[PDB]
Each structure stands twice: as C-alpha cells, then as structure tokens.
Design a protein around this ligand. Structure first.
Ligand SMILES: C[C@H](CO)OC[C@@H](C)OC[C@@H](C)OC[C@@H](C)OC[C@@H](C)OC[C@H](C)OC[C@@H](C)O
Ligand SMILES: C[C@H](CO)OC[C@@H](C)OC[C@@H](C)OC[C@@H](C)OC[C@@H](C)OC[C@H](C)OC[C@@H](C)O
Ligand SMILES: C[C@H](CO)OC[C@@H](C)OC[C@@H](C)OC[C@@H](C)OC[C@@H](C)OC[C@H](C)OC[C@@H](C)O
Ligand SMILES: [Mg+2]
Ligand SMILES: [Mg+2]
Ligand SMILES: [Mg+2]
Ligand SMILES: [Mg+2]
Ligand SMILES: [Mg+2]
Ligand SMILES: [Mg+2]
Ligand SMILES: [Mn+2]
Ligand SMILES: [Mn+2]
Lengths: 253, 253
C-alpha cells in the first residue's frame, strides 16, 4: 500500500479559480494516484484550461471501477480520455501500486514521477515533448496525442521507498537533491508534500534562481550570447506555473 | 526481437588486456544483453581487475538457460553473482525484451540504459552510488551489494525504438543530445554503436570537454576552494575509462 500526501499551489494569477492542474488520489487499497496539467495556451481560445484536466481526473476515478482496465494505467488513460468532452488539453500521469510492490505508470507529456530509495533518486520518468515546452498532450483536438503515445513503464518498489510525482510546475522549479533533502527532513508525507510544493513555489517566482527549466532552456539553444552573460543579463529564473505535488510512502508489501 | 550492435574501446592504458568492461549479447530470439564494468582500484589489491566482470557475464549467459530465472533479470543477477568466484567487483545491467515489447531491466551501479523514441530520450536509468564515483557494485566481498539492491524496472517498447546501453565510461563522456544526434544520423546498429563509442572516447581524453562527469562533480561541491585545493586543481575534462556501447533496435513485435 501507499501512505499518500498531496499539496497544490496554483499560479498566483490563476489562484482565484484554483489553477489548471488537477489530481486524483486513492490510498485505501494498493495505492493509486494521477495528475493532469491543463495546458496554459487555451485561454487564447476563450477556453478554460481547467475543465479538461478536471474532467480527465473525474473519469479516471470512474474507470478505476472498470475491471477491464483498472490494472493498466495506459488503458485507464484510453478510457478517461475518450470520455472527456470538455474542450482543452492536458499532460497526465497515472501510477498504481500492486500488492507485490510493482508500481505501474503511464504518462503523456511532462508530468513526472521519481522514486527515492536510500537517499537518492533511483527512478525518474522522462518528459515527452514536440519541442521545448510543447509537451505531448491528450486533447479535444485531433492534433493531440492518444493513449498509444503514452510512456508505459513499471518499477519494483520496496518498503520505505518514497514516490514523488507532480506537474511540470513542480519539476521545472526544484532539483533532485532538493527533493531528497526536503524529504529527509520532513516527518510525514503531508508535511513533505507541502514543503516540496512551497520550495518549488519560492523558486518559481524567483527571477534570480537558475532553475531546472532555465538550465534546460540554455541547453536547447535559447541562451544569450556568451559575451552577454553578465550578472543581471543571464538566461535564468524560475518558471511560474501551477504546482502539484504527490508524496507517497510504500508500506505493508 | 532486437537487432543488436556493440563496440568496446578500452581505457588507453589498458588496451593490451582489453580493459575491465565485459558484455554479453544474444539477438537470436526475443533479445537480451548485459554489461558489467569491473571496478577500477582492484589492481591495488594485486587482483586481476577484469576477471570478476568477465566471469559474471559468462555465468549470466549460462543462467539464461535456467528456466527458473531466465525471464527475470534480477534473478539472473542473483544466480550469476553467487556463481562468481573471481575476486573483484563490478557494476552491471541486464536487459531482456519479451515478444510483447516489454523490456525488463535489472541494474546494480552506474551502467546505464536509455530508450530513444521519436527523436528524444523517453526512458533513462538512474545510477546508484554510495557517494560520488563509488557505485553500488556486486562483489566477492561482503561489503558489496547483492541482487536485493538492484533497481528493477520495465518499459514498454514499440517497433523502431532504439536502446542505448553501456558502462559509465560511455555515459560520463557523452550528453543525451549527442546520443540522439548520432542515432539520428546512423544507418544501422553497428554504425551507431561504433560512432557513439568513438565520440565518447574522443571526449574522454579531452581536457577541454566539460563532460557530464566533470559537470556532475562540480554540482556536488568539488569545485569549492577546500576541495579544489585538496585535489590540486579544478576537476575538468573527460573521464578516461573503458567504454562499452550496446545499440539495439526493436523489431518484429
Ligand atoms: C499538440 C499540438 C502540438 O503539435 O498542438 C497543441 C494544441 C492542442 O494546443 C494548442 C491550443 C492551445 O490551441 C487550440 C487550437 C488548436 O484550437 C483548436 C481549434 C481549431 O478548434 C476549432 C473549433 C472552433 O473549436 C470549437 C470548440 C468548441 O472546441
Ligand atoms: O542554488 C543552490 C541549489 C538550489 O541549486 C542546486 C544546484 C547545486 O544544482 C546543481 C546544478 C549544476 O545542476 C546539476 C546538473 C547535473 O544539472 C542538472 C540539470 C537539472 O539538468 C538540466 C540539463 C537540461 O542541463
Ligand atoms: C579477500 C581478501 C583476502 O585477503 O580479504 C581482504 C578484504 C579486506 O578485501 C579487501 C577489500 C577491502 O578490497 C575491496 C576494495 C579493493 O574495493 C572497494 C569496494 C569493493 O568497496 C566499496 C563498497 C561497495 O562500498 C564501501 C562503502 C562506500 O560502503
Ligand atoms: Mg497547466
Ligand atoms: Mg519542460
Ligand atoms: Mg507545461
Ligand atoms: Mg571499470
Ligand atoms: Mg558517476
Ligand atoms: Mg566507474
Ligand atoms: Mn504546468
Ligand atoms: Mn567504468
């Protein structure tokens, strides 16, 4: 099973309506969770990006009671996506722990999941994108991706392992060593999820912080010329974004 | 199945004996390969540093004919390790493709495996270490790790996926985008394995190349004045090492 804690911090400008990230958690049995990040660009269509991600999570809850798909995260995505009628799009990850400790994962886009064991990250999902900051995404539009495009994987867990999952707003704004440090000094999953989300939030609004996002952008060629890299002029900064964090401790295998 | 190509370049000062990396490949059925990196430093014990990795690979091939373990990389490691009598130690990875396209992996230490799909890395193993450059390792000595310490995972593959695996001598000396670039311009697995190994080799002997190894060391704090003064200068350049590259293309699922 999993002991699961969660925290969400919307982008400051979108806080009034709850942001556009959505999630699902059920820790009653083996342990299951999901995160969906509604894609920011939809406001330009006079479309609320939160409807699609929220509906995707609602249908995930329903299809978890469908015995033909409820042990296969990729097939859960298939059914939840097909049932979603709201206009919009989202990145999404679903993870479920079997009683044997096998964690099954399906991911479309740039949500993420890491496993921390014995003080280090030993498993980390890779984001999918068409180009920088344009993720694979499930959509109301034919141009989007489908369950066939999901990254589908598993990892065998052991008691005491810590799973950390969330949206790109989290991972773009926090380094692996910070995740490990915060986890180590938190007394429980609820406190860990809040402290992790708050640290990412602090970084996300800090224009002076060299975030994973800004480092990654410089690696792609978005950098300024090397002769213009004075202090005050570098391509650095957190990435303001909705932040969703799920922290899950493996128990009773 | 897998179409598999390989290329090995020993450390320039260990070429006469072939270095201390070892590997096994079998592309005749569903596809399986393994890499073991004998740990540098056993030569200080006056121990033949290549014997443990070579023997571990030999026993891996034998236990691939043991029906009790031959569909479980972690159990293959268990048997191969227990059968190895040579003094020494090694990091190791075993990967096995089922006919469904499920790639099963078990890894101890800092060998690595990446999956490249549609022009990007979509899966990447995480190295295990006790501290910087001191990896988890299977050993002749009680202080080493066992199969219970392996990271065990799977990833679902599709036709055309490219698997790139190898020892730390490869991954410490090449960036993911170089791997993707070389794979993109290679007409076959043999050509990719040789081009990848040769590029890593060129980097490994280049004091001017800011290698993944040297960047990682700086991110740990070995560039601070106390550690820089202790080692005698900045930690820079490629990392000289045995280089092993396996490239496998997914076919006929
Ligand atoms: C993934 C790919 C990248 O290759 O692109 C991502 C894309 C999904 O995100 C772009 C999005 C922010 O803009 C949506 C845009 C495509 O509008 C759709 C339009 C054609 O619908 C017409 C029609 C009147 O709509 C009626 C309304 C009721 O739905
Ligand atoms: O301020 C103190 C502290 C909050 O900052 C943490 C700092 C120490 O991080 C190290 C940094 C150099 O990154 C490590 C390196 C391996 O690149 C990884 C990096 C995410 O990968 C990005 C890649 C695309 O280039
Ligand atoms: C058999 C002989 C016969 O005389 O008995 C002598 C015995 C004392 O063996 C010598 C041994 C100490 O040499 C091992 C060393 C050369 O390699 C270091 C590595 C194996 O340990 C790292 C290990 C995982 O990590 C350690 C720490 C980071 O947790
Ligand atoms: Mg969003
Ligand atoms: Mg991104
Ligand atoms: Mg995003
Ligand atoms: Mg070695
Ligand atoms: Mg290393
Ligand atoms: Mg090494
Ligand atoms: Mn986001
Ligand atoms: Mn090596």
């Amino acid at each position: 099973g999993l002991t699961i804690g969660t925290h969400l911090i919307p982008h400051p400008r979108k806080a009034e309506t709850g942001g556009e990230d959505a999630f699902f958690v059920n820790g009653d049995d083996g342990g299951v969770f999901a995160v969906a990040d509604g894609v920011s660009g939809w406001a330009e269509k006079d479309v609320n990006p939160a409807l699609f991600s929220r509906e995707l999570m609602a249908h995930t809850s329903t299809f978890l009671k469908d015995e033909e798909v409820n042990h296969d995260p990729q097939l859960l995505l298939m059914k939840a996506h097909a049932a979603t009628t709201s206009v919009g799009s989202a990145t999404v990850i679903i993870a479920m722990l079997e009683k044997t400790g096998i964690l099954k994962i399906a991911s479309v886009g740039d949500c993420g999941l890491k496993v921390i064991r014995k003080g280090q990250v030993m498993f980390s999902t890779c984001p999918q994108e068409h180009y920088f900051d344009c993720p694979y995404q499930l959509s109301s539009e034919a141009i989007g991706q489908t369950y066939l495009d999901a990254l589908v994987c598993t990892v065998n867990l052991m008691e005491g392992d810590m799973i950390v999952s969330g949206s790109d707003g989290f991972f773009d704004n926090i380094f692996d060593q910070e995740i490990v440090s915060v986890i180590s000094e938190s007394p429980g999953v609820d406190e860990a999820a809040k402290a992790l989300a708050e640290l990412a939030r602090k970084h996300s609004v800090d224009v002076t912080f060299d975030s994973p996002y800004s480092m990654e952008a410089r690696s792609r060629g978005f950098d300024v010329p090397s002769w213009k890299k004075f202090i005050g002029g570098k391509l650095i900064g957190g990435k303001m974004n909705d932040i969703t964090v799920i922290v899950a401790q493996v128990k009773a295998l």
